[PDB]
Structure 1
Amino acid sequence: ESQFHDKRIAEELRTLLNKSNVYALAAGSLNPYYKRTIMMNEYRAKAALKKNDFVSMADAKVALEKIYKEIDEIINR
């Protein structure tokens, strides 16, 4: 059974990558893992916006909400 989802794009990973730098700043009291993982998700997200690929955009989005949630948690205690 073949199936296709298509490119109707209504995601603001803009919104996420808008704070991608503030979150980078706040991981600077944490293991290098956290910053490094922002540095390497920013990349994916940007390329993905440029080629307008859906699946790369959805990935990166999930990735960023996850790491922001981790950071928040850690920081709030």
Structure 2
Amino acid sequence: GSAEELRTLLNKSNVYALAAGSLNPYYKRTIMMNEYRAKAALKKNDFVSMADAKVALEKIYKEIDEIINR
């Protein structure tokens, strides 16, 4: 379900923010924005915001992985 999936993504957010210190400031600030949006969406049980934060976090983690790995 969306809440559990989103918490799992959040559990990697600080790790990804540290890794993002090697890259343009865009990456960390995108992670931090979505930490805020994800945490607020969970607290309100807002499924629309939970889905948006899930997609955004998946997207930024993939971007960071692809820069660092390639």
TM-score by length of 2: 0.93
CA shift, 1:12, in A, is 1.8
Distance 1:12 1:62 in 2: 11
- 1:73 correspondence with 2:57: no
Distance 1:63 1:32 in 2: 16
Unaligned runs of 5+ in 2: none
Unaligned runs of 5+ in 1: 1-9
Relative contact order: is structure 1 or structure 2 higher (C-alpha 8 Å, sep ≥ 6)?
Answer: 2
Length, aligned pairs only:
68
> Which of 11, 21, 33 is the matching residue for 1:28?
21
Distance 1:28 1:50 in 2: 28
Structure of larger gyration radius: 1
Q: CA RMSD in A?
A: 0.9
TM-score by length of 1: 0.85
CA shift, 1:75, in A, is 0.2
* Per-residue Cα deviation, 1:5-36 (whole angstroms, up to 9, x for no partner): xxxxx642111000001000000010000001
Identity %: 100
